[PDB]
């Protein structure tokens, strides 16, 4: 489902591919060892920054290391999103809205309203929130219990 380093000519070509396809909550494998992260370690992405292509942009929780570590795009191979288990049946890609019963959403409205419909982009690392792209505001953070699938 995801390409690997061998599918590209240069390191920077691959890093651009990883950057366009990575999201918080994804599982990844270390495909090139870096400091404390050994090749083949498996990590869950917990934070993404967007500085230069060669900067430390990807923070993961690594299984073999037993803790968190920042790596570059070139160091990771994308595996995929875990299955839905929030019991909300909300999944990546679904259309969602803020519940009518919510007066002010946990992280504030921003440019969103009760009539906005957005697309789920990621499950936040804390297991309680989602990142949603709405037409009126990209990277909008919602508390899952305040959101619902659009009928």
């Amino acid at each position: 489902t995801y390409k690997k380093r061998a599918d590209f000519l240069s390191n920077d070509d691959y890093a651009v591919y990883v950057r366009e396809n990575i999201q918080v909550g994804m599982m990844v494998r270390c495909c090139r060892a870096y400091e404390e992260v050994c090749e083949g370690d498996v990590g869950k992405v917990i934070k993404l920054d967007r500085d230069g292509l060669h900067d430390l942009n990807v923070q993961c929780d690594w299984q073999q290391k037993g803790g968190t570590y920042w790596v570059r795009y070139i160091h990771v191979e994308l595996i995929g999103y875990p299955p839905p288990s929030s019991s909300s049946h909300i999944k990546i890609g679904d259309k969602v809205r803020v519940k009518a019963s919510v007066t002010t959403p946990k992280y504030k409205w921003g440019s969103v309203t009760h009539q906005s419909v957005g697309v789920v982009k990621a499950f936040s690392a804390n297991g309680k929130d989602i990142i949603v792209d709405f037409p009126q505001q990209s990277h909008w953070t919602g508390l899952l219990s305040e959101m619902e699938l659009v009928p």
């Binding site: 400091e35 404390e36 430390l56 959403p105 992280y107 504030k108 969103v112 953070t141």
Partner: protein
């Protein structure tokens, strides 16, 4: 202050001060940690 709320606040609209932060862990904490690493000349892993 080492950090400014408008720059590091993680809400969908900026908080007016860190005392108003609505996150479970205050946005100022991680901000101060990353600021201290930079001030020590270290990268994001402390290296």
């Amino acid at each position: 202050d080492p950090c400014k709320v408008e720059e590091v606040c993680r809400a969908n609209e900026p908080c007016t001060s860190f005392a108003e932060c609505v996150c479970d862990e205050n946005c100022e904490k991680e901000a101060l940690y990353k600021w201290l690493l930079k001030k020590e000349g270290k990268d994001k892993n402390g290296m």
